[PDB]
C-alpha cells in the first residue's frame, strides 16, 4: 500500500509567490512558491496518486503584511482551498495569543490541528477543548493512517502562548497517544510536528510506532541528489534514523516560505511495516504556473492589504536618523529604535528568576535603508517602514557566548570608516571603541543588561557566559562577514517579520522619539 | 454703587478639603478648603451682600484624582452647586484636549465660560463657536457688569490645546473687547484671567477700561495685614497698579488648592469709575463647617474614586527599585521611571525648531516613598503608585541657566553617604560624580539631552544656557537645600499631579520594564 505524503512547513505568510530568497517577488519570470502554484502542483499529484495526505508542520502564521492584516484568517482561508488534510501548531501559531490562534484559525479551519504536547489549564481548558487535538485517525483510500502532532517545548520563550498552556516535553506527551492508536488498530502512523530536525530525530528514533516524521520549525532542507536552487541540504531525503527498535524511520522537512513543496512515497505492507521510501522536495519555480482562481483570490484579498500599507500606525515628533552616514559609522536613532522594537517584541513569561529571557540586540547598520522624516505630520506607514526594512527579513533569538559577540563587536569596526554595512546597532548593549588600536582589539569596554535580575542594570561581558541575543536572520546566518555568528551560535529560533515588529512597537508607543543616548562611543 | 467679588483660581481639583499644605486631609480638626466648606462660606454672603459675583479664574482641572476619574464633570457638578457666575480658562483646562474641555465642561457649566485670546481654526472654530466667549455682560442687582476672560499665551507648552488653537497676546486680544463692551454702555469692567501675577499686573497697566483684575496660575498671595496660615504674600491684597490713564486698578488672586476665597469689595460711582476697594482672601479653615449636602454629595462621588484606586493601571516584570538605600545613593529604576514619565507627560506641539520644548528631568530621591514588587502577576494600581508618591504634589516645568543645574548637582552629593533627600535621580542628563573631590566640586561630567535638535542626542551642559526642567514642585520652591533652584530660576509653571503623571504613563505603556542605565555614574 503506497501512501504520498506531500508536505510544507514554515510557510510564514508567503501566500504570493517569492523571489528566490523568499523575499518580495519582482521578477516574475523567475518568481517562486506562493499558494497559487502550490495548489497547482497539489492538484496535479491528487489526479495521479490514489492515496494523498497534504500535511502542514506548522508556522503559516507570521512572516509578511498578509498576517500583519488578516491574521490567521488568510491561513485558514488559503489552507482550507488547498484541502490540507491536517496541521501541527506551530509555535508561531501562538504569536497573537491564545484567542489569535482559536479566532480566527482553529474555528475556521476544515482539517484537524494537531498538537499532542500542549495541555491548557484554568477556564481555557474548557474553552479551547476539541479546536486542536493530540491526534486526528484519518480515511485515506481503504485504509486509515494516525496524525500524531508535536510542537516545540520552546513555544513560551518564542511565540506569546500565555499562562495557560503548558508545553511538555514532546517523546514524554507522544508515546501515550501512539500507544493508544496502535490499540485501535491503527497501523500506520505520522509523527507530524513543530519542534526542529534535531528534536525529529529523536522522536523518529525514541517514539515507538511512528512510522515517519514529517517537520518543521528549523527550516531544514533536506534532498537526495543535485540541490535544485541555492538551498544547501542538511542531509539526504528522506533521512533515515534507525529506532530503538530497529526500523528504519524516514524524517522530512522542507526548507521555509513555500519555496518547496515536500513529495515523500511510502510503501507500507499490509500490517503497516515500512517497506521503503523515497521522494524529494519540488521546487515551486515559474515552470509551475499559478492557478488562475487562487492567484485572482488571492489579487482580491491583496487589496486589503495595498490599504492598510498607507495608513498611518503611529508617529515620530523625531527625525528618524536611518542614513548609511549615521548607521554605519556611529549610533543612529534608527537603529536604537529598531533594536528596542526587537525587544519588546521578545518580552514573554517568565518564572521569578528572569525580568525577561533576553534583553539584548544586535542588527547591521547597512540593514537600515531609509531615514523617515517626521515632517508630514509626523506620519509613519507601513510603506515607511519597508523602505528602511526592505528585505523581508526576521529578527531572530540566538543564544551566543560572549567570546563570540566580542569577536562580533570586533567586526562591526575591523575595517571602520569605508561606510561598510557590519557596523553594529545595538540595545542593551553598551560599548566602547578604541579605533587607534589594531583591527580585532578595538573594543574596550562591552557592557550587558542583565536578564536574571529583578531591577535590569548593566554589567561587563562575560566570555564564557551565554547570551540570549535579537538580530536579523541575516546576521544569525552568517552574512555581512559574521561567520563567527553563525558557527559559534548555541541555539537559533526563527523570529518575526522585521516591519512587523517595528510597526507593532511603533503602533504600542503611538508617539515615538527615540534618542542617540551612548549605547556606542569612541575613545 | 457696591460689587462684592469672590474668587477662586488653581483649585486644582481641591474638591476635598486637604491638609495646610493642600495635600491629603489627615486631621478633620485642622483641615482646610475643599467646596463643601467653599459654598458654606459662598452662601453667608450671598445672604449678606445685595451685588455678588462668584469667579473662578481657571485651573480647576488637575490635581487629584478627582480629575483622573471624572474628567471636568466633577467641576461643572461642583462649580454648578456653587452656582459660579463666570469663569475663565485656565492652561490646565486643555489637558485632556480641546475635546476634553468641550465634554464636559463646556457643554455642561451653567456659567460663561471664558477667554477673548483664544482663537479656534480649521472645523474646530464651527465646533466651539459660543462654547466659551471673549466675554459675557451680567446683570448684577440693577447694573450689568462686563467680565472678559483671558488665558496665558504659554497655554500650548503648558497643557495640550492641539495645532488647532492660537493663543494670542493678552493684552492685543483683549484691548478691542473692552473697546467694545464701552461701545455697549458697560461701564464696569473685570478682566479676569489666567496668565500670571505678572501679566496681570501689565493688563491692568495697560488695558484701557479694566477696573479691576482678577488672576491666577502663579498661585500668588496677596494679603493686607499679618497672613493668616503659611503662605508669605507677595504684596498687599489688592495689589493696586496705576494704569496708563491714572486710575487705581486693584489686581487680586487667591493662592491656589481652595485653600482661601478672595474677597474683594469695590465701589463704584455711577458712571463706573472706581472710588476705592478692599478685601482679603479668606482662610477656609475649619472654623467655618462643610455644608453638609455638598459635604454628602462629595462622599457619594468618591465611592467611584475608591473603585478606581484599586484598579490594575498597567503591569511592570522588573521591581520598582524605589527603596531609600537605592534612590537616595545611586541612580534607581523607579526614579528613571518616574522622570521617563514626567518627559513623555510634557511631550507638546513644536514649529521646526524643536523636538519637544523641554527634554530634561530631576527628581529628588527623598521624595521616592516606596518601591513596588512585581511578583503580584505585575499589577500596578493608584494606591501603589499612592504610596510612591505620597505628598500630593506636581511635577513642574521651570527654565533653569546651566550654571544653576550645575550647583543643584552639586547640592545632590555635597554630603553624599547620609540617606539624605537630596540626591537626584534624573532623565535626559547623564552625570558623573567623583567623590574624592571636594563638596561643591563633584560634579565631573554633565551631558544633557538636546530640544533644539531634530535627532536627540547628548552634549555637554553650557553653563550660560537656560534649560527646561521638569521637576517636583518641592524643588522648584527651594526644598531639600534647592535655595539655587528657588532663587535663580527664570521661569515655574505648575504642571499635573505627581501620581497622575506615572499612572497615565505605565497605562499607555501597558506594560514597564525600566532599567538602571548609567544615567548616573560615580568615577
Ligand atoms: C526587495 O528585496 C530586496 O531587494 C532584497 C535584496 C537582497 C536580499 C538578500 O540580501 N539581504 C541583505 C543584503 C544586504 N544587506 C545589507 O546591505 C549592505 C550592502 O549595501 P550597500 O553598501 O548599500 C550596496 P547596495 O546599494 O547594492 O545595496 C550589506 O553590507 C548588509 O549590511 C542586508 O542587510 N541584507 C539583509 C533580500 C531582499
Ligand atoms: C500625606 O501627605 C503627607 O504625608 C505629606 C507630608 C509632607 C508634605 C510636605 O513636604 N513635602 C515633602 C517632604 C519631604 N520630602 C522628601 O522626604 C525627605 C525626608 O524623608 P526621610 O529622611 O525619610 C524622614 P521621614 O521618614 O520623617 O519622612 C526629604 O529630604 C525630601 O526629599 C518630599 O519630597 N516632600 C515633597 C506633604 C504631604
Ligand atoms: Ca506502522
Ligand atoms: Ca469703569
Ligand atoms: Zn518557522
Ligand atoms: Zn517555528
Ligand atoms: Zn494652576
Ligand atoms: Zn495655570
Redesign the interface.
Known sequence: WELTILHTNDVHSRLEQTSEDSSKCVDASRCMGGVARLFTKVQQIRRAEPNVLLLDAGDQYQGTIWFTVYKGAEVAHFMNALRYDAMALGNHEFDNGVEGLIEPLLKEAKFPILSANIKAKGPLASQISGLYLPYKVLPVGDEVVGIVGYTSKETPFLSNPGTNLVFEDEITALQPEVDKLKTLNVNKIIALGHSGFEMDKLIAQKVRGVDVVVGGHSNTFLYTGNPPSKEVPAGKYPFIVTSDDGRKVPVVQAYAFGKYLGYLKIEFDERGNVISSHGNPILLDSSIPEDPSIKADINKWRIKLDDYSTQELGKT???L?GSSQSCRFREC?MGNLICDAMINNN?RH?D?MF??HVSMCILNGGGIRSPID??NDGTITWENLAAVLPFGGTFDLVQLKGSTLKKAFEHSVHRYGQSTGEFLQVGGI?VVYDLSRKPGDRVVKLDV?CTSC?????DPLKMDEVYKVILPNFLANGGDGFQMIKDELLRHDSGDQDINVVSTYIS?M??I??????RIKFS
Open positions: 515628533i523625531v527625525y536618523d536613532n518580552l517568565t521569578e525580568w525577561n517626521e515632517r553598551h543588561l529583578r531591577v535590569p542594570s548593566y504600542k503611538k508617539v522619539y527615540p534618542a542617540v543616548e551612548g
